Nucleic acid binder design. Structure first.
Ligand SMILES: [Mg+2]
Ligand SMILES: [Mg+2]
Ligand SMILES: [Mg+2]
Ligand SMILES: [Mg+2]
Ligand SMILES: [Mg+2]
Ligand SMILES: [Mg+2]
Lengths: 199, 129, 87, 142, 92, 84
RNA sequence: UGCUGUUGCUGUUAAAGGGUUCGUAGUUGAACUGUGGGCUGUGCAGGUUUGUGGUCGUUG
RNA sequence: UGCGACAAAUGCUUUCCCAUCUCGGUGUGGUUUAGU
C-alpha cells in the first residue's frame, strides 16, 4: 500500500495497527496539508509506541523517526503533531528521534574518542527537547534532598504555559519510560532574572 | 588562578558556617564537590542543596544547619592505605568519636569509616566535623 | 541527648541550651545570651498561661543581628506575619 | 588585561542560556554560510565577520544557527587565515611598535610594551606549534 | 592601514605582479586594476607609471612607506617599487 | 521586610540590579530591534549595541552611530524591540 | 627543639619579600562523556482523594 | 557489469546554477488549517 512508504522498509511487511494508522495519516497529510506537503515525501517513521499515562486521560503516541530527519521534523513539528493528534482522538503525539547511546567506556583513551552527541547526557537532553520542541528549556536545577535523592527540575518560559501545561505530565512520564530518568517541570516568567512563576 | 575547586568550595562552606549563615553559594561546581556534599549530607552535617545549571561549571546553593563546625580539603591528595586510617584520624580529626575523613577510593568517594568497612584505600580528599 | 555511658548513664554534667538562630551551644560564661518568653494568646485577646521561649546566643547580640534573628524565628513559629493581608 | 599587566578588567560578553535562534530569524543555515564565506572573501577576520552579522543581519551567534563556528566554516571552505587571527594581530602590534621605535629610540615606554608583546608571542606561538596550527620550526623574528 | 589590509587580501586571493617592468606590461594590456607606488620610487619612474595609469584610466595609490615597506606589506622578503593587482580577488 | 532572601530564588528587585555576569545565571544585556529607515521605511534588524557602521541597504543611510555602550539611532527613525 | 618546621616555624615594627618586569628548566594547573530500571517484603518523608476551635462570604 | 534484502549521526522526492510564466483534537482558551 502506498501509505506504507511512510514506514521503514523493515516494518512495511507486517505493520502494527498504530504504525499503519500513523502511516496512513502521514500519507494523507503529504498531499492535503499545504505546509506538510513540502516536507513529508522525504520523511518516514521507524515505529509507533503507545504509552499509558497513569491517573490521566488519553494515551501518548510516541513516534520514532530516523535522526537524519531531525531538521525536517523540526521545521513542521508543531503542525505535524497537531494534525496527528486530531487524526487520533484521545491521544497525544510526540515525535522523538531515535538516537544511539554509546555506553561510557572504562578506558581514558576510549573516552577521548566518544562522539559527544552519542553520550547519554546529550541524548537524554535531546529527547527532552524533542518532546517539548516549540518551547525551549530556560533553566535546569537539581534538588538534592537530604535523603540522597537528586531530582531534576526543568524550567520552561511562562509564555508557553497555556500551550504545554496540559501535556507536561505526559511528557514527564514518557521521559521516564524512555530514559529511565525522572524530570519535574516549572515555569519562569523572567528566565533572564531566574524568576519562577507561582501559577 | 584557582587550582583546586574542591578546596575553594570547602573553604566557602567553612566561612559561611563560622559566620552562621543559613545558605551559601558555591562557584564553580564539580562532580567531586557534589560527591563531597552528598557525603556530608548523608551524615547530616548539611541540609538540602541545589545545583544550578548555567551551561558552564555550575553553581551550588547549600542550605546549612548549624551542625558543621569545620570542613576543609587536604592538598595534595595523599595516598592512604587501610592501615593509615588511624593516623589520619589522629592528625586531623578532633576526636575518635565524631568527624569524618573523606577518601577517593576506586569504589567511589566515601567517608573513612565506610572505606574501612569496605577494606579499601585511596586518596584523602578532605574532612568535616 | 548528651554523652552516654556504655551501660546507659548520662555522664554529662548538664545539657547546654542551643541558640534558636545559629544552633550554637550557649556557654555558662557569655553573659550576653538572653532568654525571651513570648506570651501565648488565646482566641480572645487575653494571654494564656503558656508562653513561647527562644534562646539567643551572646555573640549574635554583639553583631547586632539578634533583631533579624528574632524576626526570622518568630515568623517560623507562626507568631509573626510576614506581610499584611490583601486589601 | 591580566597577562602582562596589573589590569583586572571584567568586561566581556555573556552568552545566553537559551541557544535556540529566535523565531523571527528566517535566514537559512546555508545562506548564513554563504554570508560568512563571502565576508571572509571580502577580507574580514572571523571576529569582524561575526560583528557584521550580529549588527546588521540579526544573527547573534553563527554557531547557534549553522551549528558551526565562523573559523570552522572558513576552514571547511579553506578560507581560514594562514596565521591564526590573534597571532596575526599581535605580530602586527609588534611590527607597528618596532617601526615606531626606529624613529623614537628614547621611547622607553614603547620599548617596555614591546618586550611584553614579544614575550606574549613566544607563548602563543609555542601553543600553536604544540597544537599544530603552526608549522614546527616556526619562529617569531624581530 | 586600509591599504595594508587590501594588499594582504589581494596576496591571499587575488592576482598581482611585482616590479616596475611587469606593472608597465600589465598597464599596456587592459589587465591592471590598481597600481601601488612606494614613496621611495625614483621620480622619473613614478612619473612614467603615473602617465601610463592616466592613459589607461587605472587607479593609482601612493603608498606611505618605501619599497622595503611595500615588499613587507606584500609578505615578501624583497623590495618592490611598483605593485600591480590584476585580479582584486574579491578585495575591492 | 521580614522576607529573608533565598540565594536559589532571588527577588526580582535585587536580581535586576545585578551585573550581567554576577546574576545567578549570566546572560546578555543586549537585544535586536527592527528599524525603519527614515527614507524608504525598509525594515532593518539592528543590534542594540552595534559598533560597526550599520547601513540600510538601498538608501545606504547610516541607521545608527556607535557609542561607548548602546548604539544611537538616527533621528526620526522607527524602531521596535524584537522578542527573545 | 614547632630553634630546620613534610606532618610543623617565621618574614609591617623583633632576623628575614628580591627595586621592577620578563623568563626557561621546575612546580602547579577550570568544568564536562556518569543518578541504572522496574517487583516484592520492611521502616521513613510530602504531590490529593472520601470523610471530619478557627479565618471567610453570609454552608460558606 | 548488473541483482535482491537491510541500515545510515543529519532531508538529495534536495541545494545551487539558466530559462517560461468554520473543522477536528485538547484544556476549562490556546492549537495546524480554512473562510474573512
Ligand atoms: Mg605571569
Ligand atoms: Mg623561630
Ligand atoms: Mg627587620
Ligand atoms: Mg617589595
Ligand atoms: Mg603536567
Ligand atoms: Mg581537573
Amino acid at each position: 500500500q502506498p501509505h506504507l512508504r511512510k514506514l521503514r522498509k523493515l516494518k512495511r511487511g507486517k505493520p502494527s495497527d498504530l504504525e499503519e494508522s500513523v502511516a496512513k495519516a502521514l500519507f494523507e497529510l503529504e498531499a492535503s496539508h499545504k505546509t506538510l506537503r513540502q516536507e513529508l515525501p522525504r520523511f518516514h517513521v521507524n515505529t509507533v509506541r503507545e504509552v499509558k499515562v497513569p491517573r490521566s486521560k488519553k494515551t501518548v503516541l510516541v513516534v520514532f523517526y530516523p535522526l537524519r530527519f531531525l531538521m525536517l521534523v523540526r521545521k513542521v513539528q508543531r503542525a505535524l503533531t497537531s494534525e496527528l493528534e486530531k487524526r487520533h482522538p484521545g491521544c497525544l503525539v510526540m515525535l522523538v528521534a531515535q538516537r544511539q547511546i554509546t555506553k561510557r567506556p572504562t578506558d581514558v583513551y576510549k573516552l577521548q574518542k566518544v562522539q559527544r552527541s552519542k553520550t547519554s547526557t546529550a541524548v537524554f537532553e535531546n529527547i527532552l527537547n524533542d518532546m517539548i520542541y516549540p518551547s525551549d528549556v530556560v533553566g535546569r536545577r537539581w534538588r538534592c534532598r537530604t535523603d540522597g535523592s537528586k531530582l531534576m527540575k526543568v524550567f520552561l518560559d511562562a509564555r508557553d504555559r497555556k500551550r504545554i501545561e496540559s501535556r507536561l505530565r505526559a511528557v514527564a512520564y514518557v521521559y521516564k519510560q524512555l530514559t529511565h530518568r525522572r524530570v519535574s517541570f516549572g515555569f519562569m516568567w523572567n528566565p533572564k532574572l531566574q524568576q519562577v512563576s507561582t501559577r | 588562578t584557582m587550582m583546586s575547586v574542591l578546596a575553594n568550595a570547602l573553604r566557602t562552606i567553612a566561612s559561611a558556617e563560622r559566620r552562621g549563615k543559613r545558605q551559601v553559594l558555591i562557584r564553580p561546581s564539580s562532580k567531586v564537590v557534589v560527591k563531597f556534599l552528598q557525603v556530608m549530607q548523608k551524615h547530616g552535617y548539611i541540609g538540602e542543596f541545589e545545583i544550578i545549571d548555567d551551561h558552564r561549571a555550575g553553581k551550588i546553593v547549600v542550605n546549612l544547619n548549624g551542625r558543621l563546625n569545620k570542613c576543609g580539603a587536604i592538598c595534595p591528595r595523599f595516598d592512604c592505605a587501610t592501615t593509615d586510617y588511624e593516623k589520619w584520624m589522629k592528625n586531623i580529626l578532633p576526636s575518635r568519636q565524631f568527624g569524618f575523613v573523606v577518601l577517593t577510593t576506586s569504589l567511589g568517594i566515601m567517608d573513612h569509616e565506610e572505606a574501612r568497612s569496605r577494606n579499601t584505600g585511596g586518596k584523602v580528599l578532605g574532612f568535616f566535623y | 541527648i548528651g554523652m552516654f555511658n556504655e551501660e546507659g548513664e548520662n555522664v554529662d554534667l548538664y545539657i547546654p541550651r542551643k541558640c534558636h538562630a545559629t544552633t550554637t551551644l550557649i556557654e555558662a560564661h557569655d553573659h550576653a545570651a538572653v532568654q525571651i518568653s513570648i506570651a501565648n494568646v488565646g482566641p480572645n485577646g487575653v494571654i494564656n498561661g503558656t508562653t513561647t521561649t527562644l534562646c539567643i546566643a551572646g555573640y549574635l547580640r554583639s553583631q547586632g543581628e539578634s533583631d533579624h534573628a528574632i524576626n526570622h524565628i518568630t515568623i517560623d513559629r507562626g507568631i509573626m506575619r510576614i506581610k499584611t493581608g490583601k486589601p | 588585561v591580566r597577562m602582562h599587566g596589573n589590569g583586572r578588567g571584567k568586561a566581556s560578553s555573556a552568552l545566553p542560556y537559551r541557544r535556540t535562534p529566535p523565531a523571527w530569524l528566517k535566514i537559512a543555515s546555508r545562506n548564513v554560510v554563504k554570508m560568512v564565506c563571502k565576508s571572509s572573501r571580502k577580507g574580514m577576520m572571523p571576529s569582524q565577520i561575526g560583528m557584521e552579522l550580529r549588527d546588521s543581519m540579526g544573527i547573534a551567534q553563527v554557531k547557534n544557527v549553522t551549528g558551526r563556528k565562523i573559523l570552522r566554516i572558513l576552514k571547511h571552505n579553506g578560507l581560514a587565515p594562514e596565521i591564526p587571527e590573534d597571532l596575526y594581530f599581535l605580530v602586527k602590534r609588534a611590527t607597528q611598535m618596532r617601526k615606531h621605535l626606529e624613529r623614537h629610540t628614547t621611547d622607553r615606554d614603547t620599548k617596555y610594551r614591546l618586550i611584553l608583546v614579544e614575550s606574549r608571542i613566544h607563548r602563543l606561538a609555542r601553543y600553536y606549534k604544540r597544537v599544530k596550527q603552526l608549522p614546527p620550526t616556526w619562529k617569531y623574528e624581530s | 592601514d586600509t591599504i595594508n589590509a587590501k594588499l594582504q587580501l589581494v596576496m591571499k586571493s587575488g592576482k598581482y605582479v611585482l616590479g616596475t617592468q611587469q606593472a608597465l606590461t600589465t598597464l599596456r594590456q587592459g589587465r591592471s586594476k590598481l597600481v601601488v607606488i612606494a614613496n621611495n620610487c625614483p621620480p622619473i619612474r613614478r612619473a612614467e607609471v603615473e602617465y601610463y595609469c592616466t592613459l589607461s584610466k587605472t587607479p593609482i595609490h601612493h603608498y606611505s612607506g618605501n619599497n622595503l615597506d611595500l615588499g613587507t606589506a606584500c609578505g615578501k622578503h624583497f623590495r618592490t617599487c611598483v605593485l600591480s593587482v590584476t585580479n582584486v580577488g574579491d578585495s575591492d | 521586610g521580614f522576607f529573608d532572601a533565598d540565594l536559589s530564588y532571588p527577588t526580582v528587585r535585587t536580581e535586576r540590579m545585578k551585573h550581567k555576569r554576577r546574576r545567578l545565571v549570566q546572560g546578555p544585556n543586549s537585544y535586536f530591534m527592527d528599524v525603519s529607515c527614515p527614507r524608504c521605511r525598509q525594515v532593518t534588524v539592528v543590534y542594540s549595541h552595534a559598533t560597526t557602521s550599520v547601513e540600510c541597504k538601498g538608501c545606504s543611510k547610516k541607521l545608527c552611530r556607535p557609542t561607548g555602550g548602546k548604539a544611537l539611532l538616527v533621528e526620526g527613525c522607527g524602531y521596535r524591540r524584537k522578542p527573545d
